[PDB]
């Protein structure tokens, strides 16, 4: 239902489960970007803790595919690792679809970069880049801003 | 003969040109060395760090050490020739995996370094800050820096 962070229950890092705790008043929302030209044009949805899909498939990132409306899974919840910094917050959501011909097949992650900007709780979700090019490693990067992020 | 440097994923023809364009652009930070001491005894440390450079004293290929201030004892949190480098719009993560294993910790997993470095168009390099120490994971544990640096502008 939640993001889940390694480790079985009772061994989870304490930190992770305080940042989570900390974003909680973002887990209802959900925020949008479509970019790219065709036949690339995507339609980035992201949710933090929350189903992002229409498939049910546990998705905390989805890429929609404009074209056909098909939905590619970047990263999923249930593999969650959170951690923060002076003024910002990142989030990974690992365990997202396997890359076809692309980085040895690997699953699909999203990082997402949260900047501390004190004048909104959540604001500017921004699809920054995707590394595809690595022989393992290889990512989708967002950026957005969040007060719950400066400390 | 070069020095050593900074050594990506991935065999030669292989590794990511988006990191090796990265690693050029901090080239004018490979001379310099930044040191923090931190904490308090019996736990006070010196963390040494180089971009893509030996910081250690043991010629181990350390991108970031912990020296323990109190016997001197060299620990190594991260080895250069394990790098992953990335950027957002106004900063750049260098990581550095490979460091000295975990005794009691971690899966007894090998020690990682995390560098968070923010755009500050005012200088080149400055203010590298021990951040903060996660060891309470069973896995993918790391230690946290920060560092301000023109370089990771625009």
Redesign the interface.
């Known amino acids: 239902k939640t993001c889940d962070l ?3 229950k009772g ?6 489960l305080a940042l989570l705790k900390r974003l909680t008043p973002l887990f209802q929302k959900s925020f949008e970007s479509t970019v790219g030209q065709s036949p690339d044009m995507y339609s980035y949805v992201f949710r933090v803790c929350r189903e992002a899909g229409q498939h049910s498939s546990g998705a905390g990132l989805v890429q929609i595919q404009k074209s056909n409306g098909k939905e590619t899974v970047v990263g999923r919840f249930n593999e969650t ?1 959170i ?1 923060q ?2 003024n ?1 917050i990142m989030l990974i959501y690992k365990g997202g679809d396997e890359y076809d011909n692309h980085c040895g097949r690997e699953q699909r992650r999203a990082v997402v ?1 949260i900047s501390c900007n004190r004048h909104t709780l959540a604001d500017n979700f921004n699809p ?1 880049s995707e ?1 595809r ?5 290889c ?1 989708y ?1 967002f ?1 957005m801003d969040s007060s719950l992020a400066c400390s």
């Open positions: 390694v480790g079985e061994k989870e890092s304490e930190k992770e690792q951690f910094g002076s910002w970069m920054v590394e090019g690595k022989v393992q490693d990512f990067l950026e």
